[PDB]
Design a protein around this ligand. Structure first.
Ligand SMILES: NC(=O)c1ccc[n+]([C@@H]2O[C@H](COP(=O)([O-])OP(=O)(O)OC[C@H]3O[C@@H](n4cnc5c(N)ncnc54)[C@H](OP(=O)(O)O)[C@@H]3O)[C@@H](O)[C@H]2O)c1
Ligand SMILES: NC(=O)c1ccc[n+]([C@@H]2O[C@H](COP(=O)([O-])OP(=O)(O)OC[C@H]3O[C@@H](n4cnc5c(N)ncnc54)[C@H](OP(=O)(O)O)[C@@H]3O)[C@@H](O)[C@H]2O)c1
Ligand SMILES: [Mg+2]
Ligand SMILES: [Mg+2]
Lengths: 409, 409
């Protein structure tokens, strides 16, 4: 019999992931779960034929039904215009979905006992939440060709005095300057999503800033987090035996390095962008990392794999050659989206399914069945032999059958 | 029989490091090397006595004689002005010496094979250089208390052809905003010290930036490094089988994590401050890290331990309790200073001494004779027993006695 799974927006995507995506639904999901499924094809073909409007449609569909699961999509560049004869160099679907939904993106590992990390001691997930707006990413930067002054000026709407600050007087030669900003409302959303994510996963939360030097800019993030914590989350944190602390970024990267893991780490835009590439690598393959967008509203979530379409593997797949692409990240996109769906609907049976699929995936790996990327974590890439791993399809077949066995009890 | 070691400027310091400093000189340096020493007591009491003049004097002496070796010093805060009745909250001696000399600080680990790192494969040194100036550290930040526009502006010295960059029109509520800059001259210096360090150590060099988004601000860093490489350093790198490449920060932090080590990593101001704490902890104890200032002139160096005065340890020492403070970093401040003295004076015998003391230090530890911090890296802090390590004095006595053995050869 089939579990009543509810409403979910489903976004098909490109290349290697698209093939894996279909295998996941066919073999892992639809056999066990009936869904009020709203599909939008964000394949690059159907994106061009609708002028990116299927993307905006899907973002709004997530806003309406609250749970989005998305396959990796090609982000058009020049090479990709030539490739598909694209009418316009369309923007990142993730950029467009983020911008429409708001929210913070959090990256959580999938951890298996028999797969060594690069940071030996990481035994639990370090979940980085990256504040997705402003700072360096909406900066206004320029070359300073020669002598002159760079000033920054605030002009109040309430009539009162314009303020002008000298940033630097270039007396000889030139250089470089920029302005950047953040927005109180965005910082509050970032805060809300981080507090909520910590309360739902059951881990403490740390915020990193550099407020020792950026006393006003970063002080603001620190103040906003503290004041939201105090008036809206503190007592749930203590009832759950969790805490919230602000840290200096220099202390935090050191603490994360020495940690066992088991915490949420809210990062500023740039720090999240960098520190999450470090942490993912410290865990191992990107095939073991999801990327989940969590809106401030408590309700709306969008889940994907942290990696891309895996073009290189797709090229070999197009040539009739062997592939071993890790599907775990795509699977946990499904399971983590489904678990959130189940939390919204109070659906014990769906929560039970999502968790059992995670367990089947981990157990199957723990038993010796794994893709090449994972075999390389054990032996070192130069020593992997063909008998150490399964191809993509053998691995999915195995997971599909172990799942079936696990679901019978 | 003594080695003529030449001219060295020596700077005494504070607390636990100060005790260790004297021991190093008495037991490891002075029995073997005669020096034209120029001593300066940058202990906290003497800085106060001379209104921080001894710090400026020391820095002018480094300028004159080209090599400096410095013990860890107290940076005054409120609590410290109380402790010593300081007539003013004196500036960090590091930042006073750095501003006077120019130069870029580079951090290099000491690696022993029986001491595990936190990061698996790190087997060779990852030497981060930090651009010492500008960006966040000389920025102009402020709170935006309500609606209004923020604009940053460049006005050429002749007062003509002003360019205004709108950073944000804050329509509802407020936020935060910032102007920052860098300077061509400073960036060139940074490039020269990085290229020189790479060619002296015999490692390749990477420069990390975020030029995918900061196209003008960071492309300037990239362009300047590239034009100084192509004009002045390329043929030397090629003769030494060594390369220079620019990397995106996101790629670099991932590369470093996956690496076996063995490169110089030039970082921008903020990235250097952050990633060097991450890397230091990835290696283990701070007692195994030095911090060497290298001036663009090719000639002038200042060496010290990357750690501080180890105040916690010093308190135990002041109450007549046993202490175990790693002196390796202070020793490598002396050996790396003396090697640079040797390079400048073409002093084979001094060069031999420096390297032998480094070897002795590593071998002693590799043979099981070590301080508590290192025993903690092997066993885990909670599992360390007294018999797993040596106390400070026992450890120095053992080095001094292995050193004497090695010098008979
Ligand atoms: N959210 C998104 O939709 C998203 C995110 C990132 C990138 N992209 C897009 O995806 C495309 C590919 O970009 P990319 O090559 O930079 O990124 P990628 O797809 O993440 O692939 C980079 C490399 O990482 C390894 N890898 C990644 N995912 C893996 C998996 N599931 N299993 C095994 N190995 C995996 C592979 O290493 P080896 O090659 O060494 O095997 C692979 O070639 C681009 O079109 C880009 O725009 C999309
Ligand atoms: N370059 C400099 O001159 C410099 C740099 C940094 C700090 N400081 C000054 O140093 C003082 C102390 O600052 P801090 O306490 O933050 O930093 P610290 O002196 O570096 O001590 C930090 C902690 O790291 C461990 N540690 C550091 N050095 C060690 C060594 N050689 N052997 C074994 N363990 C070591 C100890 O950990 P456990 O306590 O866990 O054992 C120690 O308590 C302050 O006055 C500060 O201003 C100076
Ligand atoms: Mg990134
Ligand atoms: Mg730092």
């Amino acid at each position: 019999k089939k579990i009543s799974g509810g409403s979910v927006v489903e976004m098909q995507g490109d290349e290697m992931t698209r093939i894996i995506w279909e295998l996941i639904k066919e073999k892992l999901i639809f056999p066990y779960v009936e869904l009020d499924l709203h599909s939008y094809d964000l394949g690059i073909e159907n994106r061009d034929a609708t002028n990116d409007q299927v993307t905006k449609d899907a973002a709004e569909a997530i806003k309406k039904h609250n749970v989005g699961v998305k396959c990796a999509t090609i982000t058009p560049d020049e090479k990709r215009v030539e490739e598909f004869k694209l009418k316009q160099m369309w923007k990142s679907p993730n950029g467009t979905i983020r911008n429409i939904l708001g929210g913070t993106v959090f990256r959580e590992a999938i951890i298996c006992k028999n797969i060594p990390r690069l940071v030996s001691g990481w035994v639990k997930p370090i979940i980085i939440g990256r504040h997705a707006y402003g700072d360096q990413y909406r900066a206004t930067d320029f070359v300073v060709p020669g002598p002159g002054k760079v000033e920054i000026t605030y002009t109040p709407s309430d009539g009162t005095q314009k303020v002008t600050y000298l940033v630097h007087n270039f007396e000889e030669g030139g250089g470089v300057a920029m302005g950047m900003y953040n927005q109180d409302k965005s910082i509050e959303d970032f805060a809300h999503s981080s507090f909520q994510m910590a309360l739902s996963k059951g881990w403490p939360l740390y915020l990193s800033t550099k407020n020792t030097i950026l006393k006003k800019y970063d002080g603001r993030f620190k103040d906003i987090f503290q004041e939201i914590y105090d008036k809206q989350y503190k007592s749930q944190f203590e009832a759950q035996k969790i805490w919230y602390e602000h840290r200096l970024i220099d202390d935090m990267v050191a603490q994360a390095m020495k940690s066992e893991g088991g915490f949420i780490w809210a990062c500023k835009n740039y720090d999240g962008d960098v520190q999450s590439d470090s942490v993912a690598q410290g865990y191992g393959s990107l095939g073991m990392m999801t990327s989940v967008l969590v809106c401030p509203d408590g309700k709306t979530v969008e889940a994907e794999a942290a990696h891309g379409t895996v073009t290189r593997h797709y090229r070999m797949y197009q040539k009739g050659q062997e592939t071993s692409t890790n599907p775990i990240a795509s699977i946990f996109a499904w399971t983590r989206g489904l678990a959130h769906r189940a939390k919204l609907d109070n659906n014990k049976e769906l929560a039970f399914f999502a968790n059992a699929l995670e367990e089947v995936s981990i157990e199957t790996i723990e038993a010796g069945f794994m893709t090449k990327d994972l075999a390389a974590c054990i032996k070192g890439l130069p020593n992997v032999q063909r008998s150490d791993y399964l191809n993509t399809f053998e691995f999915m077949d195995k997971l599909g059958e172990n799942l079936k066995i696990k679901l019978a009890q």
